[PDB]
């Protein structure tokens, strides 16, 4: 992916003239409320948290920023990105914030800090500059309008070349016909936020909206104070991250076609992160008139029943949370992975070759990471691969094969016999 563009169309929190917003519409950005600070910090700290939040995805990427892009900063930025990534994809962000909303042309309004000091930029110009493949993140009040405009202009480029398009990824906040609703509970950069800290955001949304008493004593204060690093499983954040990624990958493998799943979720870390978070955010965002939009032909993964288990993973974990935060209680590992491995063994116990294959093979893929459940998963794989030859080939198709291959670089000679048995069957 090489390089990233961070385009900041921030008119120091100045509202546009084409809206009239309610009193609790002073919605923050990047967990920062720019309306409480002046230009030197209202424009700077947002960029700082963007840089941190995206280095958390890929610190290797060539991050470039453009605050108040006027004319030539845009051209220099996208030219540099083309030069670094002539063949590879280029990621490219939007906010559409500030004075009048994004339009079909592709204008920016940050020339000289005024409603009238706008700039008639064109999407066609950027598409011409981005002759290489591209990834776009449209976090805008009318992001679907921008998606439709970009699809039409990329189609225009494709038609001009035939008489970059067809290698483009696009993710956006909403549909062109649906503006982002005035919900005070949401941050203004909804689609940047939800793809950035999906764990606490989903927890907050369900705590607010899932009007259930199944988890008493849990409030948004606790959700904002959950300890963890998203990999330290001793705290709720690591366990929830692991379970959520497992659920999302499993549902996508079950539902999405292999041509798109095996490239989006495997050939790039950030693309996988954005699409996983996008499916979860889609499940959240369909509830109100904020219809998400996406470039690839992905069926509606939110409809899948396994998302219900997501709530259970929350319902168990949050049940411990009030004493995890307040009393410092050590987290108790969730039964999700044990239950799903039991489901895999149930499918094996059915003893039928040509039912629908096991849905939990991606769960096995993400359970081969750590010993404590990898041992059960490996025993189950040894049982599974004695089925017909399809059981072998699917194990290569799911992505278990690279993980077992990687597991065959360890020194655990007490574990190597099982691993070699399994790997001998997967490669057959």
């Amino acid at each position: 992916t090489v390089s990233v563009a961070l385009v900041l169309c921030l008119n120091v929190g100045v509202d546009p003239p084409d809206v009239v917003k309610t009193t609790p519409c002073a919605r923050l950005e990047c967990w920062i409320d720019p309306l409480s600070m002046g230009p030197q910090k209202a424009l700077e700290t947002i960029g700082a948290n963007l840089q941190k939040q995206y280095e958390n995805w890929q610190p290797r990427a060539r991050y470039k920023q453009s605050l108040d892009p006027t004319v030539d900063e845009v051209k220099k930025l996208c030219t540099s990105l083309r030069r670094n990534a002539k063949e590879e994809r280029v990621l490219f962000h939007y906010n559409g914030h500030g004075v009048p909303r994004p339009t079909v042309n592709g204008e920016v309004w940050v020339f000289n800090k005024n409603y009238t000091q706008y700039i008639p930029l064109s999407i066609y110009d950027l598409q011409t500059w981005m002759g290489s493949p591209s990834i776009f993140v449209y976090d805008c009040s009318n992001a679907g309008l921008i998606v439709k405009s970009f699809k039409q202009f990329a189609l225009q480029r494709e038609q001009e070349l035939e008489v970059s398009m067809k290698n483009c990824i696009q993710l956006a906040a909403c549909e062109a016909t649906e503006l982002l609703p005035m919900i005070p509970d949401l941050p203004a950069d909804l689609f940047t936020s939800c793809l950035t800290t999906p764990i606490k955001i989903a927890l907050r949304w369900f705590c607010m909206q899932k009007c259930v008493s199944l988890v008493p004593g849990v409030t948004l204060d606790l959700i904002e104070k959950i300890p963890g690093r998203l990999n330290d499983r001793r705290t709720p954040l690591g366990e929830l991250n692991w379970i959520f990624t497992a659920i999302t990958d499993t549902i996508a493998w079950n539902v999405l076609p292999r041509d798109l799943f095996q490239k989006l979720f495997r050939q790039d870390l950030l693309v996988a992160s954005l699409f996983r978070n996008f499916l979860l955010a889609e499940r959240i965002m369909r509830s109100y008139n904020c219809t998400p939009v996406s470039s690839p032909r992905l069926p509606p993964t939110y409809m899948h029943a396994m998302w219900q288990a997501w709530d259970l993973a929350v319902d168990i974990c949050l049940s411990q949370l009030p004493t995890i935060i307040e009393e410092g209680t050590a987290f108790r590992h969730s039964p999700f992975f044990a239950e799903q491995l039991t489901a895999f063994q149930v499918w094996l116990t059915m003893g039928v070759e040509n039912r629908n294959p096991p849905e939990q093979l991606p769960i096995v893929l993400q359970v081969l990471l750590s010993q404590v459940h990898r041992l059960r998963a490996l025993d189950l794989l040894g049982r599974f691969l004695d089925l017909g030859p399809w059981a072998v080939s699917l194990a290569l198709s799911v992505g278990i094969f690279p993980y077992v291959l990687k597991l065959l670089q360890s020194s655990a000679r007490e574990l190597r016999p099982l691993l070699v048995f399994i790997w001998a069957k997967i490669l057959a």
């Binding site: 495997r266 993400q366 081969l368 990471l369 750590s370 990898r374 690279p402 993980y403 990687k406 670089q409």
Partner: peptide, 8 residues
Amino acid sequence: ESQFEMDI
């Protein structure tokens, strides 16, 4: 290869 950390 792997998209996650592994106890290896």
